[PDB]
Amino acid sequence: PQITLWQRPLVTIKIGGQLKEALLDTGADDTVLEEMSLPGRWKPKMIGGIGGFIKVRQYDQILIEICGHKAIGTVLVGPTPVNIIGRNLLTQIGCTLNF
Amino acid sequence: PQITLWQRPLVTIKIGGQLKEALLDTGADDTVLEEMSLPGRWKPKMIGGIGGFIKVRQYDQILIEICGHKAIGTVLVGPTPVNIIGRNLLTQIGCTLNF
Numbered sequence: 001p002q003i004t005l006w007q008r009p010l011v012t013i014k015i016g017g018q019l020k021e022a023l024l025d026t027g028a029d030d031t032v033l034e035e036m037s038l039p040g041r042w043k044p045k046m047i048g049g050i051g052g053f054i055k056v057r058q059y060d061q062i063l064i065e066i067c068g069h070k071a072i073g074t075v076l077v078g079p080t081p082v083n084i085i086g087r088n089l090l091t092q093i094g095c096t097l098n099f
Numbered sequence: 100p101q102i103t104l105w106q107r108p109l110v111t112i113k114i115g116g117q118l119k120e121a122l123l124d125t126g127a128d129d130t131v132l133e134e135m136s137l138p139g140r141w142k143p144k145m146i147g148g149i150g151g152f153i154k155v156r157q158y159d160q161i162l163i164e165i166c167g168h169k170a171i172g173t174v175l176v177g178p179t180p181v182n183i184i185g186r187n188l189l190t191q192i193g194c195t196l197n198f
């Protein structure tokens with residue numbers, strides 16, 4: 001699909017058999033979901049953008065279905081105010097900036 | 100152009116005749132620039148990021164030339180680590196997400 005930006009680009013994603021909203025964020029290197037439950041082992045990592053850093057848990061090779069497209073990659077989990085799909089998954093579905 | 104995301108989408112922008120580097124950020128409501136001077140009167144504002152919040156100065160009706168495409172609008176100046184082009188400008192150069 002083509003998505004204009006007059007509104008925040010929130011799109012259905014499915015993970016672990018669940019539906020959630022998430023933000024396609026080309027300004028973000030990684031993907032970061034609100035606190036949730038995930039299988040596998042995880043490593044603590046520290047991220048920060050505007051306004052400081054937060055301690056997030058890193059899972060590797062997690063599958064997420066974004067707008068119906070399958071992508072497998074790292075996903076960060078911590079106290080973000082919004083689920084964030086970053087470029088590490090955005091590449092997987094062949095998403096680009098057009099104009 | 101059709102910009103992939105294997106790298107952060109850093110492009111060249113032109114403001115008040117000056118050239119700078121900005122990150123095309125679909126995950127940003129607002130455009131936020133690195134401390135600079137801009138004509139006119141500003142209103143104080145709060146913007147929340149991933150870490151937490153920062154306070155920035157709001158300038159209105161600002162001309163800015165993004166990759167050869169003129170767009171006018173609200174630009175926030177504040178202690179940001181990088182110049183951020185937000186949706187309020189991206190819509191203006193007809194930018195969209197496509198996958």
Ligand SMILES: COC(=O)N[C@H](C(=O)N[C@H](Cc1ccc(-c2ccccn2)cc1)C[C@H](O)[C@H](Cc1ccccc1)NC(=O)[C@@H](n1ccn(Cc2cccc(C)n2)c1=O)C(C)(C)C)C(C)(C)C
Nearest residue numbers: 027028029047048049050081082126127128147148149181
């Ligand atoms: C409505 O609130 C907003 O729009 N907030 C905006 C915002 O923060 N938007 C989005 C999150 C978001 C989005 C929505 C909400 C929100 C809030 C309330 C209600 C609803 N939604 C909350 C948070 C995220 C925004 O892209 C920033 C842009 C950005 C890029 C670079 C440096 C600083 C800021 N990305 C990051 O912070 C990412 N980051 C940090 C560094 N790098 C790599 C890097 C390293 C070195 C150098 C460079 C260039 N990059 C990343 O990938 C993180 C670590 C968060 C993954 C902003 C910019 C205006 C504060």
